Design an enzyme around this catalytic site. Sequence first.
Site: not given
Lengths: 507, 507
Positions: B170-171, B405-406
């Site tokens: 549940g929540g 770009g790494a």
Amino acid sequence: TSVNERIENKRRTALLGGGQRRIDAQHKRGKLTARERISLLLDPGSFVESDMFVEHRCADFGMAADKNKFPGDSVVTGRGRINGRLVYVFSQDFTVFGGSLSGAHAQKICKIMDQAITVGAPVIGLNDSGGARIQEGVESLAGYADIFLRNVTASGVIPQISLIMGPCAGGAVYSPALTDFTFMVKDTSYLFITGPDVVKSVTNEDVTQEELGGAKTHTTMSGVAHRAFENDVDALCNLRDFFNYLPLSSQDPAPVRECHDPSDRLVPELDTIVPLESTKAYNMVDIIHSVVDEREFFEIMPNYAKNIIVGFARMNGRTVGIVGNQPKVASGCLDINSSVKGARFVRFCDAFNIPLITFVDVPGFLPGTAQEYGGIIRHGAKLLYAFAEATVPKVTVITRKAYGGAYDVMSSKHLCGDTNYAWPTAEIAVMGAKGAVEIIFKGHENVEAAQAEYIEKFANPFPAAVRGFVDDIIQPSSTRARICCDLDVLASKKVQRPWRKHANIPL
Amino acid sequence: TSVNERIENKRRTALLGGGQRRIDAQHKRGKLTARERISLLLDPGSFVESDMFVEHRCADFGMAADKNKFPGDSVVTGRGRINGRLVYVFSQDFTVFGGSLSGAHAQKICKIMDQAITVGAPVIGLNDSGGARIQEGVESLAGYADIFLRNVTASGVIPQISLIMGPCAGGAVYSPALTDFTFMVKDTSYLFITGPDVVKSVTNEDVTQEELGGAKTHTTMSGVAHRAFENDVDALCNLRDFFNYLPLSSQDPAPVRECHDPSDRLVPELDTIVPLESTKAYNMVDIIHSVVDEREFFEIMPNYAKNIIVGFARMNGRTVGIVGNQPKVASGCLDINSSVKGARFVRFCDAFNIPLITFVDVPGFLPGTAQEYGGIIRHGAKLLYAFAEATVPKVTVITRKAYGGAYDVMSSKHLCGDTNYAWPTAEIAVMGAKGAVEIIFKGHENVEAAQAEYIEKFANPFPAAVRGFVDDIIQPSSTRARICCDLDVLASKKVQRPWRKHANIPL
Ligand SMILES: *C(=O)CCCC[C@@H]1SC[C@@H]2NC(=O)N[C@@H]21
Ligand SMILES: *C(=O)CCCC[C@@H]1SC[C@@H]2NC(=O)N[C@@H]21
């Protein structure tokens, strides 16, 4: 039965409230119902009711029976507008369980207080209750605690106005003590902690309802209620007009409203109000009415501490607060009661950026053991502090007398005032010429000559003005124009003050 | 029965909980009770329990019967210390109504969260529940809402650690998603929204409890749980040691603790870890262990996104966070999963003033449609942002490869880094020599000579260093001492950034 039919029946029940027979009693009693009062208070069609379908969750003592399930749970809460300006309101409904406070009752009130704080909107409460709902027990005490916490938190953020239009007992009596102004309705409203039944049981004294907590007592003798109005309809009509003076939040400037009264007109009527004879009293109210826009003045506590006048008015459209002495009563002397009313009014106006105008005519303090035993020293410090702390424009006019320590208490220039004007009859001194000469010239010959010399030099406004105590000595007829000019240039004035966790007023 | 006798019986019932037979089941099941778990977690004698006498107020469906009145209402809440440091805890008790969440249940948890925020103390939750208490209906949903509001408000103010030691449905499953770290217990804990009964009813797929929401799934495949421990006793022992790394509040500096490991010792073991052959992988963990104080390293998510390593350690007594590539797995390439784990870890350490050390060895991004269709562009931006936003000291060491770009994503100096060191084998380029020469020299004669010339000039750490990309090129044996020096001088570093209502990370 369909869902829609059930909803429609729930709406009709919430509108009826406690039932038609209980409404009939309220009208027989000369009272309006909670929903009729809101319709009068707010602009037509502007009211939006919140949480109309909320019911109590208490299942004890038979409270789970369908016969006790009144939607709305004894309060009408919601928001609306007065003349286009947003306001949050609630009104307690006496026809459902006597208007007693339940857990859910307090909740609904708390929720609209939380919105009002969030958006910056004022709250007006219309109170009428018998006290806590004892069937729930301690949930109503938690209800009071949550309301009290909101009322304290909102202070200095939004103005809180309370009008009592019926009985009030138990913990309910403390919310008007936390709000900024309290009003009542003559011979219809009461405000007491315990009823006459408890008083007679505890102490051997006889008292009735009107004597113990009536509107006349609280507006004339205890100094709790700011003003009582004749009936429910007149009370709400005057409340709307009062509302128009105040800003919506402390973040806002004092409201400015269209005004047709020229700001530069002369008032010849002022030049001869103040008599030349020092033992002749005059009515300060004639000066207040002639200066303020269109001669409209809202007087607060007209019947309590009559030696000092406080109230609201507008000059050149802008709301201002006015404080002044009343020489007609007790020679214009300060006492305990006048200091209490003054400090409270000044503090509100400062918090919500409403300029102050002071009319000073005070010969000193009321002497005697009645005042000394009552803590006149402690209470007088309240008005001195309230002015000294202020950061809003302060304009003082001295009309005739200002003797002794009362000079500084009544917002002298040395408490960070902006302007201070004297009329030709003003006299600023430690004491009158008679006392001063007898003390200064003790045992010397030709004292009568010394008396004449002292009066000619010091019994006027000059020894103070030449020292920088007074900015100008003005003809009374020009007072209004001079004040209007100061208000329109001091309105953007800001000052710095050291950081403080919170103020520490002498109390 | 006297008042004191009633109180003593209420204390004994709260200590027993749901009854001895339900405790027996918990022990048969290899689980500790909620109160036994607290005794293990906190310093002996330091625990103070709050609100032990609170009971539910629900009177519906027979809940008003005395047989359902369990004091404590299924949670143990209170405060204590771990090694003298203040901490607030709660632990859910499964023996009372299955550990389900009631209105009052959530309340008690909320109250200690409010204190922890007020004083600046961390909160540790031990979760075990079956979900909402459906007998109360919507009160348990309000309970969840209040907890969720506190968990969000506390973020960035106090660290919030959650250990799941049983089922969760549940929540309840969303509070670990709001806290900073989530841990589990192998083969004892579960985390799922709906059970296997709902899954089979909705879709024609077969699944068991361990497959749907088991600890192995959440630590290895979904990336939800940060680490699973073998059993309840080991889980709390490791939790105490983990606790010792973190500050009590974000207003505090990273904790500094007595350390015997000299800060200026050399580490000769580093010089030969990185091979000269570009297609030979090595284990980054050997570098991490040899640098950190006393070779103690706390690894987070050891079995999820193995191509990137994140965890906690101490250098010269001060807690630091470590992020680095793992060339042993997928050549050290970035992918969706590695970006998610990295950004979350970096963001926590920045918020609570814990310095970052980065070990870079990344050849680029994992190619293919599996990553492109998964939003590799969107997810890669998460790690770039997490470093660029950081205001805490950042020390980067580049061990071998940083292509494309790494280079900037893995905390390059151009994202407001403090220091960046290269080892002699470091190579910084847009791409490798083979791709670059084929593109630069297209259609020309004697390409093989151009290939040799390019490699000799660019296949090293110099074209970046001579431009200011690297502060020094250091012998690996000196790395630890160099980092220790930077940490002890950057600790008092503050930077300014423009005002923002709140950050807007790409998500
Ligand atoms: C006659 O001597 C009584 C003098 C009172 C004059 C007024 S009343 C209050 C002020 N206090 C004081 O000493 N003088 C002022
Ligand atoms: C062979 O040509 C495959 C080359 C892949 C090398 C690695 S894998 C991820 C990086 N992306 C890229 O284009 N090269 C790097």
